[PDB]
Amino acid sequence: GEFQRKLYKELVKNYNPLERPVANDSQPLTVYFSLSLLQIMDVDEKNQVLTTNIWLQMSWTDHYLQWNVSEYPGVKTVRFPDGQIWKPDILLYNSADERFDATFHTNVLVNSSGHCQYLPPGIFKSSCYIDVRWFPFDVQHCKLKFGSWSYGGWSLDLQMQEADISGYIPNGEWDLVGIPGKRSERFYECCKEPYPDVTFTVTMRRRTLYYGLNLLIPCVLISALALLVFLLPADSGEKISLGITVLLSLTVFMLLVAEIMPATSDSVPLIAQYFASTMIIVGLSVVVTVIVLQYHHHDPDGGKMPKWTRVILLNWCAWFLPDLAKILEEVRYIANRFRCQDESEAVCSEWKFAACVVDRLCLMAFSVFTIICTIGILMSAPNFVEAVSKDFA
Amino acid sequence: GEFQRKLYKELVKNYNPLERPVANDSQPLTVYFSLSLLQIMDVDEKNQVLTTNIWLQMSWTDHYLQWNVSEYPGVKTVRFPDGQIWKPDILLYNSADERFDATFHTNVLVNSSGHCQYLPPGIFKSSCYIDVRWFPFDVQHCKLKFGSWSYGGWSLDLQMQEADISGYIPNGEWDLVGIPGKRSERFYECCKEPYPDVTFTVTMRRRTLYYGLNLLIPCVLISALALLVFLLPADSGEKISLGITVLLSLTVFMLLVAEIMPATSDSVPLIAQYFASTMIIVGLSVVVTVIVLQYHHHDPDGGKMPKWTRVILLNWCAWFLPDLAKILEEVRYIANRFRCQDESEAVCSEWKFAACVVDRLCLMAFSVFTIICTIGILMSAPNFVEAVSKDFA
Amino acid sequence: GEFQRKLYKELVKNYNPLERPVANDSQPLTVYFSLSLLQIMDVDEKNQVLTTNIWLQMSWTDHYLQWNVSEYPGVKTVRFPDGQIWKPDILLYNSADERFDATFHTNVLVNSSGHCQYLPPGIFKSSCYIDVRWFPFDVQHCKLKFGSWSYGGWSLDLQMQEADISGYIPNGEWDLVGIPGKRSERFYECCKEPYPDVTFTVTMRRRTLYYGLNLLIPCVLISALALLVFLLPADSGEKISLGITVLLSLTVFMLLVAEIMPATSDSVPLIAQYFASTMIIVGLSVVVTVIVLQYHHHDPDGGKMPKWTRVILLNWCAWFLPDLAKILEEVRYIANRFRCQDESEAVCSEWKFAACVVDRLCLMAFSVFTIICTIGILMSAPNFVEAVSKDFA
Amino acid sequence: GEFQRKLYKELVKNYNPLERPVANDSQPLTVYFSLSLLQIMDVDEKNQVLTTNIWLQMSWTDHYLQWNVSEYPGVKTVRFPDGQIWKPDILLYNSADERFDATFHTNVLVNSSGHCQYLPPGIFKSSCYIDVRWFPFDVQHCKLKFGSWSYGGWSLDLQMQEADISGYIPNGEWDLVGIPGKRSERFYECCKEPYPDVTFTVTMRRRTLYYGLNLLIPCVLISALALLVFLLPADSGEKISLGITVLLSLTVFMLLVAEIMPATSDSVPLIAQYFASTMIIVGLSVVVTVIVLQYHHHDPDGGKMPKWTRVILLNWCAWFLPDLAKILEEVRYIANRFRCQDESEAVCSEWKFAACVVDRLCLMAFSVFTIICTIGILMSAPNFVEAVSKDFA
Amino acid sequence: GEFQRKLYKELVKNYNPLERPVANDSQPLTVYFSLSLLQIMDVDEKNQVLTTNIWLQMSWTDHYLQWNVSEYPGVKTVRFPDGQIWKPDILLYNSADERFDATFHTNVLVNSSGHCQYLPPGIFKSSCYIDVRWFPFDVQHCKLKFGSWSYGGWSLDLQMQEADISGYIPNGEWDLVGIPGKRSERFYECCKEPYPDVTFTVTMRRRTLYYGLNLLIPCVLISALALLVFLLPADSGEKISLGITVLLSLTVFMLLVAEIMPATSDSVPLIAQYFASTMIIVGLSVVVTVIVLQYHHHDPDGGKMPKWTRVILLNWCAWFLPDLAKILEEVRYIANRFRCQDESEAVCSEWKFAACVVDRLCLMAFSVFTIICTIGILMSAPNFVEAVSKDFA
Ligand SMILES: *[C@@H]1O[C@H](CO)[C@@H](O)[C@H](O)[C@H]1NC(C)=O
Ligand SMILES: *[C@@H]1O[C@H](CO)[C@@H](O)[C@H](O)[C@H]1NC(C)=O
Ligand SMILES: *[C@@H]1O[C@H](CO)[C@@H](O)[C@H](O)[C@H]1NC(C)=O
Ligand SMILES: *[C@@H]1O[C@H](CO)[C@@H](O)[C@H](O)[C@H]1NC(C)=O
Ligand SMILES: *[C@@H]1O[C@H](CO)[C@@H](O)[C@H](O)[C@H]1NC(C)=O
Numbered sequence A, B, C, D, E: 001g002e003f004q005r006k007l008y009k010e011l012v013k014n015y016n017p018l019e020r021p022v023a024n025d026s027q028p029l030t031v032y033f034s035l036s037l038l039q040i041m042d043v044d045e046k047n048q049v050l051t052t053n054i055w056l057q058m059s060w061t062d063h064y065l066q067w068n069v070s071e072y073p074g075v076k077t078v079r080f081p082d083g084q085i086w087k088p089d090i091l092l093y094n095s096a097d098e099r100f101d102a103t104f105h106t107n108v109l110v111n112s113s114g115h116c117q118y119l120p121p122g123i124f125k126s127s128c129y130i131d132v133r134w135f136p137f138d139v140q141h142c143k144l145k146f147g148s149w150s151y152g153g154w155s156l157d158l159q160m161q162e163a164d165i166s167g168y169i170p171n172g173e174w175d176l177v178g179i180p181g182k183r184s185e186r187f188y189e190c191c192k193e194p195y196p197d198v199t200f201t202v203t204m205r206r207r208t209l210y211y212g213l214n215l216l217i218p219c220v221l222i223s224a225l226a227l228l229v230f231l232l233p234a235d236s237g238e239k240i241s242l243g244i245t246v247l248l249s250l251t252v253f254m255l256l257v258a259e260i261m262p263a264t265s266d267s268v269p270l271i272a273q274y275f276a277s278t279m280i281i282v283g284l285s286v287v288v289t290v291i292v293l294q295y296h297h298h299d300p301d302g303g304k305m306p307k308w309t310r311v312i313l314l315n316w317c318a319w320f321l322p323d324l325a326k327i328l329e330e331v332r333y334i335a336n337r338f339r340c341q342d343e344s345e346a347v348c349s350e351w352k353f354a355a356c357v358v359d360r361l362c363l364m365a366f367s368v369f370t371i372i373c374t375i376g377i378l379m380s381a382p383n384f385v386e387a388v389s390k391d392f393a
């Protein structure tokens, strides 16, 4: 209308977007900063990037953008575009986007008292440290650090307000615990001036039902199968084939959980340590079974030829467990061959007792590894039952 | 021509793109908003993003862009570029594009009555919740929420019109059910002002012929093969090899359907639950067959050594199913060895009866799992026959 | 020079880029539109996008950009940048690029008669329907639809000229058949005005030598191997192992041709149907061979226990194909055991006749499937020999 | 300083960036164009794109940007940004970047004589034809075609200078042979005017050490293994298992070299042809061995039942290579069974002679294929020894 | 305030962003350049790109942007945006980003003495040479080369300051050793003018715990298994199956370490050389075992038929290691068949002695290869223990 046109013509007279809008130049300009989280779009562990949907919230007071409502009846607010009035230069310090600023520039809304509001939307990709040493039951804290790039403490007085989560859309993979904020003043090598800073710490907790069904069940089944092959009597066909099958299959296909983790050499997930330990154990079992099967089975003393190992093995055993007549004489000779088969079965009994001792060693080593893994994963996080109480449902 | 030049010079005199074009500043400006869907370009389930081709439709009235046709004969419309006249700031709230606005800025067409039309094209990537718990027979509702970013209810009066689907190009994968819209007023933490909003709900239904041919046929064949190996008599070579082959092959290669689903731990697709249940069953079958095959086969009472299991197994069985003379005496001894072979075959008969009881257990557990899966997938969605009536064709 | 400077100063006096350059405002402005194809850079079937290198060609007449050559001797043409003169807003309607306009904005060349030429280059990604139901011998027609976004029939009079292919660089994968164009007037829901439109239909034909060598040879070899295993006598070791190997290997690795096709459930490629049919046949063969091998081989009447199947099988067969004395009596008993082995071999002969009947069923079903596949692929497209005449070379 | 400010104010007086800077408008403006290659960043064969790091070099003379050094003491050069003075519109015709111009716009440096230099940097992705039919010993020529888009021969007189390679950083994969340039005038369908053009042909030669160690050694080992299995006597266990293992493993895993080549059906790499030929040969060997092993082994005349094949096989062979008494009579009968075993071994000898004839056929066919492959790859390129002289080192 | 507005109006009077801000035009303008590293975001070996997060630091003096604080009380600094004052054109020469400049343009802060500071943030992708010939224990030096594009030594006097690492965030994969800088003057083919340059050399050291646990343990286990199969007696079932399993599995799956390395044919990682050598050795072992197993086992002189090999093998051996009566005569004949079995076992003993000689050859060749590999990897880098002292922890 007429009054809106007159007001817009008046307001921009002698205005300088460069100048900071304060009545007194010696005093700071208070700016209230806050955040509104709408969606956690991605939590990428390979590159360690958290991608979120966020509305910023900046509020301040402009001294020159004031008018009297009775003189311009009907108009109570005006809106200014990006390059027409002064705006704070608030940036995310720890950004991972190719462009350092990922906010869509919308209008600034001003009312009759010169109160400016600015709520730009954006999709922010920030770099945060991802820890999967406790996978799949882990809590992640990712920081978002916002601050003015070129305005010090004596010029721009940043203030913090509590973040808004009323419009949050729950994620199917991660459960939001909270998002608290902290305001602090930092000193840099640039210059002698404190710089305010506002940091929001998004805390997420994973939902373990999908990964549970995908990994825990076949992992438990494979561990039980390995326990069986440890308990299985040593034989050529079934034992060696099953051992090599478990070894190769696990060693090749277990990387489907390693492909979701970074290569950071700060710690190891407990599931990977358990896999590696059982892998070494089953490898030792298969090599020792092959040795006791094919290397030598014709004499009971073959394995115990050194006294040094013999003493320890014995201690462990004590601690744990006419012409027609000569043709019929050739029939007696094949009977003696059956007797030699009995001798070979006695040698096999001795070597199988040794192999069962080694198998019991593999067995209780594997069970101790499983026990430490499960006691670590059960009493790991405070109020762990919550997961089984909430996620498994 | 001369009149077009004169009109263009006249119209921009004293014009202010910032000012809202109304005769009375105290009354809202009515804007009619609508949509035109041309193509569903992608429905990505990994990142849960719907990518579509859309023409927006905004219509309003500009008070200052009016002229008399008799004074400028021949010219009936004018066109203005992006930054020369006032345009509504209509944005998609739930956007997933790196830039928050994905519309190509075209001209605004105005006629002699000051009626402005604006039809920008665009390719919109919006985030919507994808549910595959009913895969491959699922219906997806994805929302598109459009609204003015900085104009309240008292300034911009948004109105809704029915979406246009006359130019829709059918998709080969998804069948469009409808696209209805709803206009609602929301309250935010920004300020005391209602904000109008227009939401269009694109509803799609999957076409199951491709996935049917790709998955259902080999899945049915593999399930039948598993039924066979459950019904197959317990033996060393064929039974164990087939069981381990099914286990490993299914466990490794069934992820081709998991790679098309998100990791959201809100529910589980029924096909995955059926696969996991049959997987546990076949694993139990192979371990029990190995136990009854190699652990002990020299005595019928080997398996039934505890009374606690013996009573239950018995109840289940009742409920269901000179020197030459001594050489010829050694020939009698190998005949007695054949008799011991008969004794071993009797032990094998007992152990195979036990293994067949376990196999019947595996069999009817697997059939109950298949029955619940198929009864879930058959009577799942209302008017399910439509699929077989329309898609399979 | 001096005259160029004077002319450039003169020409832009009172010029309005917004105004349409016509002497009479009541008459349309004729614009000639054409295309120049240089390279088909990609034909992506997963997302169904054709990526090409194209020079547009727009020609029109500007009424105000005229001068007298005798007054400005030496200068015959001038060039204007993007935002300094009026240009048609010609867009590709069915675009798939994230930005809806993918043309590089070059200069506009004007000569002394006010004839404007505009030849912007670009790399255009357009969405076209890809049909692989006839793979690998398929012809694809992909459309490019260009038109003015905001200028109707009464304002901009679009005209079509034949496309230029003199600079085309042949592609190694696709053979260009032609690129004809058609101009048509459309009616939209926007408004009461016809809108001209120019559509160019790029027609491509695939080159089958690479895919031929990669797929046809091993596919033929595997089909011959399957024919062998169908013709092979039923036995424990070779038959079952070969059948399961073919089944698993084909079922897992045949997806290398499915990964190049979309998931559109409109039709099925004939190669996939043939693979699925032979897959079902070989699965039935392996299950029936396992049944006749291990389920029962001790009685000839085991398989024919129901009369319903017995009658049909018989009809098919008719239509197609002292103490020392007692020890030597135990030797007679093992001779009788050899006689029982002969009885078992007779049972095996009967069961193998049945299995060979089933194998002949599998065989001629597989050959009928191969016959329909090859008769479909041979007489599919008109002038098919061209391929073997031109591509295989 | 004062003189720099005065000079900058003077120089832009009455300046027109649109106008071509010549004293006489009837004469062309000579522009010297050259290139400086710094790094070959990528040579992608899948999409056939060469990505390089290049500094362009344009030099010309501006008539209006001249001054007297004695009047402005101390200032000898000035610099102008992108849109403030006239610059040639030099573009890469065969570009593959989404944006058609991939140069960073830097300043233009002018000295007291009005000599303008322009050296913009850039990363250029150009489309060139990649030929791998001679892989891994191939030489690639990729073209870069630069020219003025809208300035003809009578307006802009392009000239060529030799490219600069003093700052080249050697690549680990490709060895640069040269980069010669050629200037030529072209005629287009646009209009009646010649258009100058400058084309630089980057010539690269691959380094074969990495691919040598990765592929040649295991390929040679696998070929030797196939030669062994061809020379191995026909038997059930080892022969068939080894043949099927080689077939399946090679057929599945040899695509690691096909994944680095385009699908262009213009020619075939010799390594792929050799693989396919040996693949057919070994497939024929395994099928014929299975036939001679299990189809029939009870009669020597089984294989030679038709005279047509019998004559050729014979020609090839000629050209190449009381009650106790009756029980002991049953013992004589099992001795006769051993005699029938001898008869079966004679049949096996005949069938194995036939199978060894077929194996010799497979053997020398495979060796001829290897011989043609190695004679093609040895005497393929002129001065081939250079590779082994330079790359293998 | 009033004074800020007056100062901003005053400062831009007669200002020229093009002009270099010096009081004397004949003297260079000193610019201090420095860097601040915050995070090493990626070190990509496939494309050889280092992606880092960096704040640049430029400081200089502007002659015209000076004022008296007593005249403008309260204002001590002003800030200017990108295009309003003169800024150095400092670029990264060896950039790999699609756009050659990857810095976010922030404000320039000026104080009362005309001292300009400029600290733009950015994410820089620079191309550096990645060497993995010492993987996984390698030190990488990647260069960042910054300089003025169009300002020579006589105009812009670049100076270097030590980089800042006080805000560095440690990486989980790479350990930062240092980042020293060097300033040097270069001569180009452009022109006769030295050009200053500042180069920072980021030095990183890998952390080997993750890769250690992932690769070293299974590699050691597989090498031990290969040692076993070399030491295992030659037999049909276990020996050949294990050898072929190791060969195929290693040859197929060892590429998981090759996928993290470039294809540069400058050197070979020692792990790959060791794998290839053991691969050749085990291939020779399996082929020779198959030859000695199935080719000929009926005569001890079969293998030693040429004197040339016989002499060397012997030298190596010396250097290292009524009617009833005739039926019972047929029983004597099967006893003689057992004697022929003993003869065959003697032939097997001779051939197995030969095979064990070949196995010892394979064994100590493999151990020498392992010894050279481990002695290379142990005493490779100075102060190697640091890794095991710091990384393994
Ligand atoms: C606003 O306008 C009305 C009428 O002119 C006047 O009474 C009132 O005092 C004005 N308000 C201020 C703060 O001047
Ligand atoms: C438009 O022009 C004609 C002639 O000048 C006049 O008769 C008519 O009244 C005008 N229309 C309006 C609304 O003034
Ligand atoms: C162009 O200039 C010449 C000389 O001034 C004149 O003779 C000629 O008539 C002019 N052409 C036109 C169309 O006026
Ligand atoms: C440049 O300036 C000096 C002194 O004013 C004068 O002598 C000289 O002639 C001038 N050069 C030209 C080309 O005019
Ligand atoms: C700055 O202003 C004060 C008061 O006007 C004056 O005394 C002082 O000399 C001024 N400083 C300079 C360098 O002129």
Ligand SMILES: CN1CCC[C@H]1c1cccnc1
Pocket: A106, A109, A117, A118, A119, B148, B149, B150, B188, B190, B195
């Ligand atoms: C309702 N709008 C859309 C989201 C924020 C809100 C708003 C309010 C005022 C200024 N900008 C944005």
